[PDB]
């Protein structure tokens, strides 16, 4: 029942419906709402609400925002998630001067391929991760967030939306218009964010499809059927691809040292079948002295 | 490849969960075996006519199932459930769903999209938005992994099969989805290459041709009887050069078990 619910303030608008801060009157409980209008709605419940509530139902991790609860009230639809306290975009935002330090990053990325790999394990793409879809909490927690864009994939996977993905963490495979895509487009994402966290700006901020693969190109290397056999082939491979050489990635991120620079290369490998996955990731000697503390900025 | 024994345990799992009620059609006054038997094979057909995933039948299926399991319906509100239903399916597994006013149409307006909308509402309340449920598909497709080598009229002539099981809610409610698929896979593998149920199956799964048996010997029987069956959708269906023509081939007349 809403009743139950004083609302506090707007948060913003999510991947579809907007959000906001509540109150459980009788609990205490700080939650997040998301109202979805089913009157406008000539379609019924929409397809990104479908799969958000029946597969964030399924997924209970310490790093997986929880789904508390879906009231269905008059025309409305309200998504009742725990409410954390910021997203990563505007911490790093926050942390422009002093920049983060490196073991809260090490434990962001640590937390963020815990829910990543429960997310593969059982089956899901998340499909849109960014800072943005990224909360943390006061106690050094960070979860992944807005489930609107994933959907259940097969083994092995069918032909799945193309339009996927936020264009500055979107995988190359998908900017090449494989017929397949799997769990190795998100852990792309995470790589991408993994460097943000580390700069504080973007890794491939394009501002169109080709603009992207070519940021790509001109950081990574452009790919060949050595690095990554059958890209030649892909759809929309041009032999007309500029060719450039692939550069140190100690110049890529500075600031990031051996074993950082070790697991960011293997997080963005052309060959989807090469990148490593959540799972394998999670034993990366990056990790060795990984712990959890909080912020270093006030919430 | 890296999650593929993660997930197989995970919708092993799941599937059980998802189970409809064995004898729920007993306690139906209403509605029987033979009515929705009707009602799966006309699904068949809108699946092809909008050229829809194998999987979001499967899928629109055990919505119908689940929900039968717990609610009464009377047999003119059956094509109503099971258009809901189709309409979920198809959102939660489609790229490009039909539009409602499809549904609407091809119920050739028995129902109105007001009726439609709501059913869906309901479809949505009583499986509390457990949507994402294991198939007879999603298992077949992991064990088709397991060919040596990859055999399309085998697994065209699986999927075939698989299918058939959706029809029949007596005896094929009481096996569960692996289960079918493992029957499945088997059979359409022996009846095109003379090959079994391979030991690399048997160590994912823990079935083994025994544990089969009981649902293999249902399934051959409906394999030699469906060109007599009150219901060919699936047959017709299976006659495409999509699936390579399966459902023109000779089942075998034993299987040596
Ligand atoms: C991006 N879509 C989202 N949906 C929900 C329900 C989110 C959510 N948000 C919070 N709290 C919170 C605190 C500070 C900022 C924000 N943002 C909204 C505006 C910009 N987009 C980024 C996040 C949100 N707590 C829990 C959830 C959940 N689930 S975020």
Redesign the interface.
């Known amino acids: 029942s809403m009743e139950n619910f004083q609302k506090v303030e707007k948060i913003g608008e999510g991947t579809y419906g907007v959000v906001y801060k509540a109150r459980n009157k009788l609990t205490g409980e700080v939650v997040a709402l998301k109202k979805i209008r089913l009157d406008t709605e ?6 990104t609400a ?2 958000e ?3 964030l ?2 997924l209970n991790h310490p790093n997986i925002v929880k789904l508390l609860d ?1 009231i ?1 009230t008059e025309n409305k639809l309200y998504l009742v998630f725990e409410f954390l306290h910021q997203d990563l975009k505007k911490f790093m935002d926050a942390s422009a001067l002093t920049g983060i330090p490196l073991p809260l990053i090490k434990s962001y990325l640590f937390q963020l391929l815990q829910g990543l790999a429960f997310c ?4 899901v793409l998340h499909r849109d991760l960014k800072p943005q879809n990224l909360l943390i909490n006061t106690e050094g927690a960070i979860k992944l967030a807005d489930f609107g864009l994933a959907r ?1 994939f ?3 996977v ?4 193309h339009e996927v993905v936020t264009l500055w963490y979107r995988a190359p495979e998908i900017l090449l218009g494989c017929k397949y895509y799997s ?1 190795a487009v998100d852990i792309w994402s995470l790589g991408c964010i993994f460097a943000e966290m580390v700069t504080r700006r973007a890794l491939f901020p394009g501002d169109s499809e080709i603009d992207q693969l070519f940021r790509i190109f001109r950081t990574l290397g452009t790919p060949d059927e050595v690095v990554w056999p059958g890209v030649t082939s892909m759809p929309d491979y041009k032999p007309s691809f500029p060719k450039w050489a692939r550069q140190d990635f100690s110049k890529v991120v500075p600031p990031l040292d051996e074993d950082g620079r070790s697991l960011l290369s293997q997080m963005l490998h052309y060959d989807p ?1 090469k990148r490593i ?1 959540a ?2 990731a999670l034993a990366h000697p990056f990790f060795q002295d990984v712990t959890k503390p909080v912020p270093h900025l006030r919430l | ?4 024994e ?3 345990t ?2 092993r799992e ?1 599937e059980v969960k998802c189970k409809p009620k064995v004898g729920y059609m007993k306690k139906q006054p209403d509605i029987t075996n033979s009515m929705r038997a009707i009602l799966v094979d006309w699904l068949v057909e809108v699946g092809e006519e909008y050229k829809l ?1 194998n ?1 979001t039948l499967h899928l629109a299926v055990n919505y119908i199932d689940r929900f039968l399991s717990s609610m009464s319906v009377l047999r003119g509100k059956l094509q109503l459930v099971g258009t809901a239903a189709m ?2 399916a198809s ?2 597994e489609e ?1 490009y ?1 039909p ?2 006013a499809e549904f609407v149409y091809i119920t050739d307006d028995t129902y109105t999209k007001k009726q ?2 709501r059913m ?2 309901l479809v ?2 009583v499986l509390t ?4 449920a294991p198939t007879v598909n ?1 298992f077949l ?2 064990y088709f ?1 397991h060919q040596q080598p990859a055999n399309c009229k085998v697994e065209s002539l699986a999927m075939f099969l698989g299918e058939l099981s959706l029809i029949d809610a007596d005896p094929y409610l009481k096996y569960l989805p692996s289960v079918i698929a493992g029957a499945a896979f088997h059979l359409a593998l022996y009846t095109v290459t003379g090959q079994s149920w391979p030991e690399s199956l048997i160590r994912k799964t823990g079935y083994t041709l025994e544990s089969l048996k009981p649902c293999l010997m249902d399934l051959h029987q409906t394999y030699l009887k469906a060109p007599q069956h009150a219901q060919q959708s699936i047959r017709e269906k299976y006659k495409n050069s999509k699936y390579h023509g399966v459902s023109l081939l000779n089942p075998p007349e034993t299987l040596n078990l």
């Open positions: 000539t379609e019924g419940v929409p397809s479908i799969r509530i029946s597969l139902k399924e879906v269905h593969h394990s059982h089956r259940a097969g083994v092995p069918r032909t799945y939306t769990t079948n996955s799972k394998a | 490849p890296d999650y593929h993660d997930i197989h995970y919708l799941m995933q999987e309409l979920l959102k939660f790229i769903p539009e409602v439609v909308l869906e509402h949505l309340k938005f457990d949507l994402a999603q497709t992991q992994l």
